[PDB]
Design a binder for this molecule. Structure first.
Ligand SMILES: O=C(O)c1cc(=O)[nH]c(=O)n1[C@@H]1O[C@H](COP(=O)(O)O)[C@@H](O)[C@H]1O
Ligand SMILES: O=C(O)c1cc(=O)[nH]c(=O)n1[C@@H]1O[C@H](COP(=O)(O)O)[C@@H](O)[C@H]1O
Lengths: 256, 256
């Protein structure tokens, strides 16, 4: 098993994955903050304070009450300053012709500011083809959703195998997965795992939590995605540091 | 098999489905226009001219370059005037906690103007639970995506059966399906079928077309969803009338 720094140099590595892996090793962080807030001011204050602790900031631009492209300009300034990627968790899931417009256009112009986006594989490979016609020219990457954290997820068995095949057949654009575990044996592919908290539990709407030690150490994922475990805490900086240290040590102990 | 007018009166019918079925029978239309345009002026001119020909106008609010909630105010005026429902084709596909915010909030406030939305079933029933916590109080309905029109779709076999079970267990909110065919034997549930053109063919990004006669007449669906077959035509009104007459006659001939 290679370090994040060595994976950043693999011959078939995508440039976005390389940039991410380099800054993960430099900063000793494999934490993605899920910045699940409705105010631009809160998003930017979290990005600035937690920037040093995270490899990535995951957005849901469509829950932000005061979205403007200028808010995203301020977020890019912080991402450059503190060295993290921006991941818009849009979960594209339409025919190729539709997702290309949803990615490039409308009010959000997601491709203009998002290093990474993600897509469901259920529509077939046209979803990836459509996205890549916008994303490849704009030097972007995509994650495919191979497994989900929620109760009753149908992303199991043959579905997960289809996501892995799709990623591997579109390696020019697809840089990894949303998954609960290592699903690809190819080290050029990132595994990002949501549904993470230090304590056992869930929410009232089908979310299920596992610990950083379980998902990084035992299940072999690369990055933890954490929302409420940080966002709902009083001291979001110390919460981020707890999750960072947990995920980083789990990674180190798997390397040996 | 019951007429649309008789289905509108079924004991377990959802109010949104009843309203739709009534206006389908009154207007002799089972055509949903996919208004896949980037300009508000074009969306509103299409809604006004084609309103009399359609039972429903399907939007992708996130490809509209000049979206404002006022554009949607003007669309609701036309929907009321010409008697059609508004369907936002958002394809919600996240955990329940996330989709409730995506449905109610952000810039789009989808639940404030959309009669219908749709959701993927891949995350499990939490996607429906989350949406219904916003949609039930706002007297809205939801369609579950049981089958898709695109090449390589994984929405087949056990997946489609899971979508039907989910719909039937959430009939307070779920009014039907996006599907290629009749998937539910319960007549209270609408079947809406995209991937429709009069001529054989496809697009370059995995879309596959079937005719109105095939999907309404042979496959037993209720409503055709048509985008480019109308939108790319020179005379979009005459194109809409051709699709309306095709879908309506296919429906009548299945009734006998
Ligand atoms: O793509 C995602 O990040 C995602 C996939 C998934 O399987 N589960 C999942 O929880 N998510 C997202 O990750 C975040 C989890 O947030 P918390 O449950 O608050 O930690 C939310 O923003 C979800 O939308
Ligand atoms: O939910 C949808 O309407 C949808 C589902 C599906 O399986 N296939 C599909 O084509 N669609 C949508 O229906 C429309 C089809 O447009 P045309 O191919 O131009 O007729 C697009 O807006 C798609 O996003």
């Amino acid at each position: 098993e290679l370090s994040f720094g060595a994976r950043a140099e693999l011959p078939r590595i995508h440039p976005v994955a390389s940039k991410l892996l380099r800054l993960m090793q430099k900063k000793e962080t494999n934490l993605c903050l899920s910045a699940d807030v409705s105010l631009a001011r809160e998003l930017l204050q979290l990005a600035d304070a937690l920037g040093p602790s995270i490899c990535m900031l995951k957005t849901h631009v469509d829950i932000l009450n005061d979205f403007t492209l200028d808010v995203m300009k301020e977020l890019i300034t912080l991402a450059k300053c503190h060295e993290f990627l921006i991941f818009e968790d849009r979960k594209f899931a339409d025919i190729g012709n539709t997702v290309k417009k949803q990615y490039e256009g409308g009010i959000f112009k997601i491709a203009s500011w998002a290093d990474l986006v993600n897509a469901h594989v259920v529509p077939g490979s046209g979803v990836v083809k459509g996205l890549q016609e916008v994303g490849l020219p704009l030097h972007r990457g995509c994650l495919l959703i191979a497994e989900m954290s929620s109760t009753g997820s149908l992303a199991t068995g043959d579905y997960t195998r289809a996501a892995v095949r799709m990623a591997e057949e579109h390696s020019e654009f697809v840089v990894g997965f949303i998954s609960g575990s290592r699903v690809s044996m190819k080290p050029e592919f990132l595994h990002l795992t949501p549904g993470v908290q230090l304590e056992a539990g869930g929410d009232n709407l089908g979310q299920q939590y596992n610990s950083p030690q379980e998902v990084i150490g035992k299940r072999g994922s690369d990055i933890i995605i954490v929302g409420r475990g940080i966002i709902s805490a009083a001291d979001r900086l110390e919460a981020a540091e707890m999750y960072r240290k947990a995920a980083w040590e789990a990674y180190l102990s798997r390397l040996g």
